[PDB]
Amino acid sequence: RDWSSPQQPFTIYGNTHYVGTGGISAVLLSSPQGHILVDGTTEKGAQVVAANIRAMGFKLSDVKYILSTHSHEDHAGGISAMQKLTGATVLAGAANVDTLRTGVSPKSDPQFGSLSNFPGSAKVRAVADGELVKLGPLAVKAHATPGHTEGGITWTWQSCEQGKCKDVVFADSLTAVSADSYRFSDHPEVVASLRGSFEAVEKLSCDIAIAAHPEVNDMWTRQQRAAKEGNSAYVDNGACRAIAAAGRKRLETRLASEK
Ligand SMILES: C[C@@H](O)[C@@H](C(=O)O)[C@H]1C[C@H](SCCNC=N)C(C(=O)O)=N1
Ligand code: NA
Ligand code: NA
Ligand code: NA
Ligand code: NA
Ligand code: NA
Ligand code: NA
Ligand code: NA
Ligand code: NA
Ligand code: NA
Ligand code: NA
Ligand code: NA
Ligand code: NA
Ligand code: NA
Ligand code: NA
Ligand code: NA
Ligand SMILES: [Zn+2]
Ligand SMILES: [Zn+2]
To answer: Are 174 and 123 spatial neighbours (Cβ–Cβ below 8 Å)?
Structure first.
C-alpha cells in the first residue's frame, strides 16, 4: 500500500467512487453532466488514478474540476498530470494556490526543509471557506481546515442511492508534523489553525468519511467488512469526530514533547 501503488477502484456510496492508490485517497464524484475528482495522489499515482477512473466507466474528458485537500507531493503530486489529461480546473484554498502552481511548499509550512517538490499545475483557482462548487447536479462544499498547510480544505457533499442519502466528507490531513528544525510552540498561527480545524471537522455532518490517508478512517478494514456487510461498512457518523480527536492528540503530544 505505497503512495503510488495500484488499487482496484470501488464505489463507496451512490456516485462516490474511490479511485486512489493503495496508500493515498482520491475520489471521483460522478454525474451524467460531468465529474469532480478529489486529489491526484503522487506524480506516479496519476497514472493509477486515470486508469481507475476509466475502469469505473468514466471518461477523463468529463472530469471538470479537481479539488485539492492540500499541496504536498503525496496528495497533489498527481494533480498536474490529471489536469492535463482532463482539462479540468483545479480548486484549492487560497494560501495553497501558489504551491500547487509551482510544486514548491513555502517557508510557513512546518515541514519546510524536509518536503519534496512536485509538478506544478495549470488552471489553479482559489475557493473560500463555505464556498459551493457546482457541476450539474453535484454540489461540493469547501471547509477551510488549515494547520497541516495554510490552504488545507476538507470537502463535503451528499450521495444518494434511490433516494437514500448520506453525507460524505473528504477529510484533509490534520496532522502536526514538521522538520527537525521547527518548533510548533513558537508558531501560534499554526497551532491556532490546527485547533480551529479539529473543531470544524468534529462538527461536520459526516456519515461517510474518506481521509486523505485512507487508513486514518480504516478504509481497508472497512472495505474488507463491506464484502459481506455491504457499503454500510463505510458508514460511521463518528468518523470525523475520530479524525479530529486523533489530530488533537498528535498536537497535544507534540506540544508536550516541546516543553
Ligand atoms: C509530506 C508528509 O506530510 C507525508 C510524508 O510522510 O512525507 C505524510 C506525513 C503525515 S502523517 C501520514 C499518515 N497519517 C496519519 N494520520 C501526512 C499527512 O497527514 O497528510 N503525510
Ligand atoms: Na489501479
Ligand atoms: Na497541469
Ligand atoms: Na477547465
Ligand atoms: Na486546498
Ligand atoms: Na502551501
Ligand atoms: Na504546502
Ligand atoms: Na494556475
Ligand atoms: Na504539519
Ligand atoms: Na493524516
Ligand atoms: Na522553529
Ligand atoms: Na523554524
Ligand atoms: Na485500514
Ligand atoms: Na449495506
Ligand atoms: Na453502518
Ligand atoms: Na459501519
Ligand atoms: Zn501533507
Ligand atoms: Zn500526506
So the answer is: no
